[PDB]
Amino acid sequence: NLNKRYGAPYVAKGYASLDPRCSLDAYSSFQQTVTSADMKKAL
């Protein structure tokens, strides 16, 4: 009779808190660009 003792963030938990969304946003930043000024700010 879980989810009574533990929360809903139990059994209904996709413990894969690693990469359901970030990987996508990773390929987002891949798309836009990086250039001189994008390094000059880092400069």
Binding site: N3, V11, A12, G14, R21, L24
Partner: protein, 48 residues
């Protein structure tokens, strides 16, 4: 390109509703004709 588990995957602890006897018609539709579960004898599953 996003799939959200939450839209289609529904894990709801649903209350198994009683067949409403207090009203006559909804008692007859609800009569899911599998009440012949009486064939649940734990019979010999690998012999006869």
């Amino acid at each position: 390109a996003t799939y959200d588990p939450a839209a289609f995957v529904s894990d709801d602890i649903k209350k198994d509703v009683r067949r409403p006897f207090w009203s006559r018609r909804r008692w007859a539709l609800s009569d899911n004709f599998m009440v012949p579960m009486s064939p649940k004898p734990k019979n010999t599953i690998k012999d006869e």
